[PDB]
Amino acid sequence: KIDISKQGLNSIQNETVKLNLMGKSKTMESKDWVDPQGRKGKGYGVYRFANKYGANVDGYSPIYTPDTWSESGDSYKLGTKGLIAWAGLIVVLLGVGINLVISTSALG
Amino acid sequence: GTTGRIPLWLVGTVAGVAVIALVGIFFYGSYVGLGSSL
Amino acid sequence: KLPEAYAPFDPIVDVLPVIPVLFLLLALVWQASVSFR
Amino acid sequence: DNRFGTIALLAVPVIGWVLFNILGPLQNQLNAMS
Amino acid sequence: AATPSLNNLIGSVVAGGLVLAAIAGAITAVSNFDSIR
Amino acid sequence: SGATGERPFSDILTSIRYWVIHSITIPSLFIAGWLFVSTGLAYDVFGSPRPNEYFTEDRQETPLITDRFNALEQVKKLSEV
Amino acid sequence: KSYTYPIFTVRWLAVHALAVPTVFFLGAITAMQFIQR
Amino acid sequence: GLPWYRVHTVVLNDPGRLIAVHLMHTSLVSGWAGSMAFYELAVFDPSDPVLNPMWRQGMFVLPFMTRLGITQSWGGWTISGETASNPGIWSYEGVAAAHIILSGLLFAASIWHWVYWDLELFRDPRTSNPALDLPKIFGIHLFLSGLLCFGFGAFHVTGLFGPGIWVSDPYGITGTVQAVAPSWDATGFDPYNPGGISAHHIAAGILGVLAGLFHLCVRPPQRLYNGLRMGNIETVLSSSIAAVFWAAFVVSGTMWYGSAATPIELFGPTRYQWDLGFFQQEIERRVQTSLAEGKSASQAWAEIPEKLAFYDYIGNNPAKGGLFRAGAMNSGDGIAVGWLGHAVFKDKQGNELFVRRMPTFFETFPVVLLDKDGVVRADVPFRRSESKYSIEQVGVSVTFYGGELDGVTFSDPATVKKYARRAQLGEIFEFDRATLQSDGVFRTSPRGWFTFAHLCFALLFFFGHIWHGARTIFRDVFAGIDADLDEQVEFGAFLKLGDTSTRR
Amino acid sequence: AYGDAARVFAGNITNKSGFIPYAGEGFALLIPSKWNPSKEQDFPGVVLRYEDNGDAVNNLVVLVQKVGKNNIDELGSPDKFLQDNAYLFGESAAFTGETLSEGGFLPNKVAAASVLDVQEATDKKGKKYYKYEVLTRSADGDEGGRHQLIAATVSNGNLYLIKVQCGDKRWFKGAKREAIGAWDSFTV
Amino acid sequence: KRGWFDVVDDWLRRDRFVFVGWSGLLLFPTAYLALGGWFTGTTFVTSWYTHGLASSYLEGCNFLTAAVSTPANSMGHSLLFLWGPEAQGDFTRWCQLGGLWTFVALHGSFSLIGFMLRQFEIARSVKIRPYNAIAFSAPISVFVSVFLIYPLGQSGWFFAPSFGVAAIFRFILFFQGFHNWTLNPFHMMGVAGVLGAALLCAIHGATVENTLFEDGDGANTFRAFNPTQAEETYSMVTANRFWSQIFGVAFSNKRWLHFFMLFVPVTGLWMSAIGVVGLALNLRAYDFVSQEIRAAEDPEFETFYTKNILLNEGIRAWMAAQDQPHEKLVFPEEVLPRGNAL
Numbered sequence A: 001k002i003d004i005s006k007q008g009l010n011s012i013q014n015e016t017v018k019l020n021l022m023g024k025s026k027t028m029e030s031k032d033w034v035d036p037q038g039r040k041g042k043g044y045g046v047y048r049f050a051n052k053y054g055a056n057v058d059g060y061s062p063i064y065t066p067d068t069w070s071e072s073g074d075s076y077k078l079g080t081k082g083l084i085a086w087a088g089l090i091v092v093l094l095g096v097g098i099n100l101v102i103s104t105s106a107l108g
Numbered sequence B: 001g002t003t004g005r006i007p008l009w010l011v012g013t014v015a016g017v018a019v020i021a022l023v024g025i026f027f028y029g030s031y032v033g034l035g036s037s038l
Numbered sequence C: 001k002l003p004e005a006y007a008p009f010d011p012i013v014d015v016l017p018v019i020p021v022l023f024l025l026l027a028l029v030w031q032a033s034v035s036f037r
Numbered sequence D: 001d002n003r004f005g006t007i008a009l010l011a012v013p014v015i016g017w018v019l020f021n022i023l024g025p026l027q028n029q030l031n032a033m034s
Numbered sequence E: 001a002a003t004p005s006l007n008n009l010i011g012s013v014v015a016g017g018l019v020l021a022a023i024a025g026a027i028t029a030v031s032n033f034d035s036i037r
Numbered sequence F: 001s002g003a004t005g006e007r008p009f010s011d012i013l014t015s016i017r018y019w020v021i022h023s024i025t026i027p028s029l030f031i032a033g034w035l036f037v038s039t040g041l042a043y044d045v046f047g048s049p050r051p052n053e054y055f056t057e058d059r060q061e062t063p064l065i066t067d068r069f070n071a072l073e074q075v076k077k078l079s080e081v
Numbered sequence G: 001k002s003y004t005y006p007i008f009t010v011r012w013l014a015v016h017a018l019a020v021p022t023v024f025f026l027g028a029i030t031a032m033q034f035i036q037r
Numbered sequence H: 001g002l003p004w005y006r007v008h009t010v011v012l013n014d015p016g017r018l019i020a021v022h023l024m025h026t027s028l029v030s031g032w033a034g035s036m037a038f039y040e041l042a043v044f045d046p047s048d049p050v051l052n053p054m055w056r057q058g059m060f061v062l063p064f065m066t067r068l069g070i071t072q073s074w075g076g077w078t079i080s081g082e083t084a085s086n087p088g089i090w091s092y093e094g095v096a097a098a099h100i101i102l103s104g105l106l107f108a109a110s111i112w113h114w115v116y117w118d119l120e121l122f123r124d125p126r127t128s129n130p131a132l133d134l135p136k137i138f139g140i141h142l143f144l145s146g147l148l149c150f151g152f153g154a155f156h157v158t159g160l161f162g163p164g165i166w167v168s169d170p171y172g173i174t175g176t177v178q179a180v181a182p183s184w185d186a187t188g189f190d191p192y193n194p195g196g197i198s199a200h201h202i203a204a205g206i207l208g209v210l211a212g213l214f215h216l217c218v219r220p221p222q223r224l225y226n227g228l229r230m231g232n233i234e235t236v237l238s239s240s241i242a243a244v245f246w247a248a249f250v251v252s253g254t255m256w257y258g259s260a261a262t263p264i265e266l267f268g269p270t271r272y273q274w275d276l277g278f279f280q281q282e283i284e285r286r287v288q289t290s291l292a293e294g295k296s297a298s299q300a301w302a303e304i305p306e307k308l309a310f311y312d313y314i315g316n317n318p319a320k321g322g323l324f325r326a327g328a329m330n331s332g333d334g335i336a337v338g339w340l341g342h343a344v345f346k347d348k349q350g351n352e353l354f355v356r357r358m359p360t361f362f363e364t365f366p367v368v369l370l371d372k373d374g375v376v377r378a379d380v381p382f383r384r385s386e387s388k389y390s391i392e393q394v395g396v397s398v399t400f401y402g403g404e405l406d407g408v409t410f411s412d413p414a415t416v417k418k419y420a421r422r423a424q425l426g427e428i429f430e431f432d433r434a435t436l437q438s439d440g441v442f443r444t445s446p447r448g449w450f451t452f453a454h455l456c457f458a459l460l461f462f463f464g465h466i467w468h469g470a471r472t473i474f475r476d477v478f479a480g481i482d483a484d485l486d487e488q489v490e491f492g493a494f495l496k497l498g499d500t501s502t503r504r
Numbered sequence I: 001a002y003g004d005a006a007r008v009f010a011g012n013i014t015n016k017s018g019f020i021p022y023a024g025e026g027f028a029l030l031i032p033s034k035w036n037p038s039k040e041q042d043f044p045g046v047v048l049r050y051e052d053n054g055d056a057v058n059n060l061v062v063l064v065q066k067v068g069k070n071n072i073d074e075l076g077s078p079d080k081f082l083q084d085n086a087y088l089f090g091e092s093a094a095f096t097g098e099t100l101s102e103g104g105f106l107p108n109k110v111a112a113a114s115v116l117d118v119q120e121a122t123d124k125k126g127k128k129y130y131k132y133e134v135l136t137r138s139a140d141g142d143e144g145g146r147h148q149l150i151a152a153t154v155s156n157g158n159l160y161l162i163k164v165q166c167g168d169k170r171w172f173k174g175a176k177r178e179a180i181g182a183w184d185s186f187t188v
Numbered sequence J: 001k002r003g004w005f006d007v008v009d010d011w012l013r014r015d016r017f018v019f020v021g022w023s024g025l026l027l028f029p030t031a032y033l034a035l036g037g038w039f040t041g042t043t044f045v046t047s048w049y050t051h052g053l054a055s056s057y058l059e060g061c062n063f064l065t066a067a068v069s070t071p072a073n074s075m076g077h078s079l080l081f082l083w084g085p086e087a088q089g090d091f092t093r094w095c096q097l098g099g100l101w102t103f104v105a106l107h108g109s110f111s112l113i114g115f116m117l118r119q120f121e122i123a124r125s126v127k128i129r130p131y132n133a134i135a136f137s138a139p140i141s142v143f144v145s146v147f148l149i150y151p152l153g154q155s156g157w158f159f160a161p162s163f164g165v166a167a168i169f170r171f172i173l174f175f176q177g178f179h180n181w182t183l184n185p186f187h188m189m190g191v192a193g194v195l196g197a198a199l200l201c202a203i204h205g206a207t208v209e210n211t212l213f214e215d216g217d218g219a220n221t222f223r224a225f226n227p228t229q230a231e232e233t234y235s236m237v238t239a240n241r242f243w244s245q246i247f248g249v250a251f252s253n254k255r256w257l258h259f260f261m262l263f264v265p266v267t268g269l270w271m272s273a274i275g276v277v278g279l280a281l282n283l284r285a286y287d288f289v290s291q292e293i294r295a296a297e298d299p300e301f302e303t304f305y306t307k308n309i310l311l312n313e314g315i316r317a318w319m320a321a322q323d324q325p326h327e328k329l330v331f332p333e334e335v336l337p338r339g340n341a342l
């Protein structure tokens, strides 16, 4: 069996994305659900043997699990001080890079 | 500090454009300069 | 060539025909924005 | 002559910038495993 | 009566040992620094 | 499934620090590659002829290495500008 | 609950062993596109 | 039921019948050697050792008997062409009969060692189960290898007690079986120095004996015993298959490139002698020296040995044959009858022209005549409509010096074209294409066939190393993998792969 | 290390004229850029031979022979000079049989040279040139025929003769420019 | 307290993102240099002094025509080390001498050994059977025979396939013109193996996808599966009956089908490897002598085989002058075999 709560998908902001990454669909589980092509469901969900195994391949091995991400990655530690220095460094290196490209070419 | 994350789709879009730009430059260079038969 | 009155606008015409292939990519980036829901 | 020098001189701002942003957490990794 | 080609062959053997020694040394160092249990 | 202990790539490629660091490192490596060719260093390190170096006044045809143990001397004469 | 990962690992060396030289080579090949005979 | 590809695995754990099964292959291999030699002796023609050597008649095992010292036949002839002097037991026929008699004895022993398989020798004294102490057995059978390697180089090759080995001059003109002395300096590792062969088999024999003594006394390390599965005899098969394909690659290389152990007088020239102009340079040198003695070109070329000229013929190149052009080289271009003499082509103004020799890579090659500085002067045009080099409009003539056609000169374009086509093949010889109805397409010498066979075997035996090598290591999972394995195979469940005591 | 930089952002091709000036002993011409020097010597007195990298049919050869006269007219009229040098177009000496099935050719003939232009130009200096344009056809039909451009002049007792030949297939595909350009650049 | 081997073994076989293992000590160094040697050679290194060709991006070639070309034929089978008697320590001259080819070929050949040892290493750790390593012997046999054995039987490394797209195409067309490699029964078995394996890959993939059981209510059938599911995902009985009534014969054993999917491709490459070993010695299946005798005697007997023989003569004559510059073949055009017109 597999526990979907410990698969790292619990912090997905969008419910639809959360369900898709979980391999689950409450809409398709109902026996009155109808396909866009007009086919009615047979009562199964996305996977019939789910519950027996706990989840489908989507929930068994997710490739996008934001729960296991590092909290330190949610913000830049240096803050506005780093960004201003980063912005200034970008301009300085951009000018040097352009000048070096121009100087070392047959242009003009 | 500054809290936030770059959206993944934006990273793919910008990286996708850069790759397409790089390939376009290679095809541009196929018609000019060295190797262009001109 | 285009008529002389339309000469300044020639560069715009030189990039117009590639717009339809951008719609295919625009659909792809639209689906990426919504996380391929 | 100095052609390789010039190019190698591009690393000095690069390494300094990366260290300015990674040195801290790098020490955290070093201490954790040592 | 060692020809210069013979010296380089000996030098290559020594250089090969140094490359192997450098590999083994680095692996043993990291293996000890980062050990299980 | 599970993970091997490394940080998820999606986490790093979405973090601000990664782009702040790689908004300089990746561009610099590109410029270094550009300067490696524009400054003529690519020709000199690997010996490929410049567009005006394939033929000389002495040799107007393709080079031919016709010696094994004197190939080092011979290729220097063929490459002489 | 809280995850802390190491910055430099064997995976890091592998990614940079291939990415760093590629970006350099990509820069070099791009410069070649503007060389005139 | 046992699959058809695992039938011979029944002697895997039966030491008595493993010997019996290995005695049967030994009986067959010696049986083949005797049968092959007798056939070759029934087809071999020893009348003409210079223009009809062994290697032109497709003889495969005859060179190997000759290489070690067998030179005489009970028929009274010698491979050199001299008359036999009391051949004794060890003739070509005697050696063939000996390998045949040995085949019968090994066949009989195989039956015995098969019926009487349950010997107390093959029983483990501790468990009473059939077992072989492979680390000790290897020491025994290696000590014999070292002893036999030493004796071959010290008595047989050296000449102390034995015939020696075939040694030839650099150009394969005068070669005999001689007693070679070991060369212990760096020249002992020259592949073309026959003195290295005696020195090697002596020194490797000494080390083989000492290694056999060590491997007979010192027990294997516990860690090495488990790592290499030394209790499993399939480990020995994997390493032996590995060693035998290593030797097959080496023995194919020295055959193709030539060495002191593959004389061209027994196996034919190598393809590199034609490529590098090895014989042509020697022929021109001898003619040039005779010209320096104020001898006529007609008589200087007559001095050139016909055996030397025959080596300068592209039909004796081992890289000009075909995979399914079966038979002897005589079956391809005929039996060599005589040398037609050197053909020198002259312009109408008297300048000498040289026919560009055919490289080995070309099945067919345009005939083009070059002058001293390498400029094209005449050729046989394909497009005979606006030609600028046809021999008719250049007046090319051919004159033969030495050989059968010495002095004779041809001027009509038809014959000049005919000999120009012959000239790009090297020296011009007269061939008899009626006795065996030769097709006209070249064939490979025993040098080519040996190389191809032992290269293909070497490549196939690499898979044997991998298969039998993977079988011994992965023996515990040969019938399948364990039922419940998912927990161990999980990514990140354990710090170290497989190790369940390193849980994360 | 040469030390020279790469021509990044150059903007100018060193030589886009399609011809490379060549100076010889007493003669000069503009060899096409794409043609390679050849060591082949088809005729007596050959001092220069360049063949096209693509097709070996397109080639030019410059001959210097010791006629001993001082004017090209002293070697005969333009028609007489061409007939005396018909060896330049090749020969059928290899084929000696008789035939009646070569369409468009005289009986027992498999090749034919058709002379299109016979002009006698003079140099700006004064040297007279006997220029000739002849299309040689063969029963093989190779290249759809070959265009032979021949310019000859006598200087210092030597007959300087250039022969630029171009296959017809290459001629109407654009190789005509290179051939005519080289034929009109030969100066002695 | 563990010894060096045990402490090092712990680190090498650590279950990380990219498994290193003991074989990684041989694979990753050699594989990186072989990859780096090829990328470096195709980008900056020239073949001007070895083949009289341009083969780098810096010289103006593109991905299709760039290559890491072989050394000149005068080098023979020299291993061409950086420190060898050829290009004695001079890196730039080493590149100009084609030494980068032997660099890529040698470090590349040891990478194949390292990768095959890696398959053994991981399979033993995961406790499964070693049939992926056995399958990898076939590509190694192809590489060993084509890039090592074939040039070793020829004049030198010059005739080995150069590491490039168009360079391989030249190597391919060289084999038709000079070896008649299409006619060889070993390339024929190699073709049947590769084409048969491509057929099996497609036919098996489609059969599984079209015999899938309905394990969900969504049209997207990819999601209705679990790697740990005990029940089969597709009906073998339906698959077997389908191909029995369409093709007349079908697989009834799942294990046999997958082994066949492994045997066809591997056997094909191995058989093809044997043929190239024969071409190393010019021991080629070039011609049928019986038809050549018949064709020479009867000038009206023509087959598609004889037409191919004339095509090979055209390939050899029109290609030798530039493909083999060491032979210094100056062919006047009149001697080149050419048909009517064209």
Ligand code: CLA
Binding pocket: H025, H026, H027, H029, H030, H032, H033, H034, H037, H061, H062, H064, H065, H067, H068, H070, H095, H096, H099, H102, H145, H146, H149, H204, H205, H207, H208, H209, H247
């Ligand atoms: C008294 C035993 C005996 C003797 C004197 C001979 C003698 C001869 N045999 Mg025969 N043979 C024998 C037994 C014997 N054989 C048996 C028992 C068999 C059955 C297997 C054969 C099968 C056989 C065949 C198939 C052939 C011969 C052939 C020959 C003739 C040429 C041998 C040769 O040059 O090959 C050279 C021998 C070698 C190159 C041996 C190489 C040794 C390898 C490389 C061992 C290296 C690994 C080693 C273990 C390293 C570790 C040791 C080291 C550390 C010291 C020669 C007259 C040939 C012949 O001419 O046909 C008539 C032939 O083709 N024999």
Ligand code: CLA
Binding pocket: H032, H039, H040, H043, H057, H058, H059, H060, H323, H324, H325, H326, H327, H328, H445, H446, H449, H450, H451, H453, H454
């Ligand atoms: C390493 C083993 C070896 C080697 C190198 C040679 C080498 C040679 N043998 Mg030989 N021979 C051998 C083993 C070997 N033999 C064995 C084991 C036998 C017992 C059968 C014989 C019996 C034998 C005879 C009777 C004769 C030779 C002859 C010759 C010489 C001619 C070669 C030839 O034309 O073969 C040609 C090879 C081929 C035409 C094809 C090679 C096999 C292909 C590549 C394998 C393909 C698979 C298979 C054929 C598919 C079958 C399809 C079916 C329709 C048949 C040559 C030097 C002949 C000779 O010159 O007399 C002096 C001779 O008449 N051999």
Ligand code: CLA
Binding pocket: E012, E013, E014, E015, E016, E017, E019, E020, J025, J026, J029, J030, J033, J079, J080, J081, J082, J083, J099, J102, J103, J104, J106, J107, J110
């Ligand atoms: C495990 C990694 C590995 C492996 C297997 C190889 C293998 C090889 N390299 Mg490579 N190389 C490597 C890593 C590796 N390399 C690295 C990291 C670099 C730096 C980037 C290079 C740079 C490099 C260059 C520049 C060249 C090679 C070359 C070669 C080839 C021949 C060189 C050789 O082995 O001669 C020497 C043989 C030995 C050293 C045998 C070693 C046996 C041990 C070590 C002996 C112990 C010595 C010790 C002192 C005991 C003394 C004994 C006493 C009798 C003296 C060979 C196939 C050459 C080549 O490509 O050919 C064209 C070449 O030019 N390599």
Ligand SMILES: CCCCCCCCCCCCCCCC(=O)OC[C@H](COP(=O)(O)OC[C@@H](O)CO)OC(=O)CCCCCCCCCCCCCCC
Binding pocket: J246, J247, J248, J249, J250, J251, J252, J253, J254, J256, J257
């Ligand atoms: C309605 C129109 C019919 C279309 C024609 C279909 C042709 C049928 C050909 C099948 C005969 C081959 C028998 C395989 C032997 C056989 O019957 O084995 C039967 C085998 C069944 O194996 P199982 O699954 O029962 O295996 C259980 C274990 O015991 C395995 O040993 O079926 C297959 O292996 C599938 C492979 C079929 C693909 C066959 C390869 C292609 C045929 C090649 C023909 C050569 C060309 C000849 C031209 C002269």
Ligand SMILES: CC1=C(/C=C/C(C)=C/C=C/C(C)=C/C=C/C=C(C)/C=C/C=C(C)/C=C/C2=C(C)CCCC2(C)C)C(C)(C)CCC1
Binding pocket: H027, H028, H029, H030, H031, H032, H035, H100, H101, H102, H103, H104, H105, H107, H108
């Ligand atoms: C008993 C006895 C006897 C007799 C014996 C004998 C008679 C022996 C012989 C035997 C024999 C007579 C044997 C033989 C054998 C043969 C073989 C063994 C071979 C096989 C072959 C093979 C194996 C091959 C294969 C193949 C082919 C076919 C094709 C190609 C490829 C190959 C080459 C692979 C005596 C009197 C002594 C007395 C005592 C007892």
Ligand SMILES: [Fe+2]
Binding pocket: J208
């Ligand atoms: Fe499957």
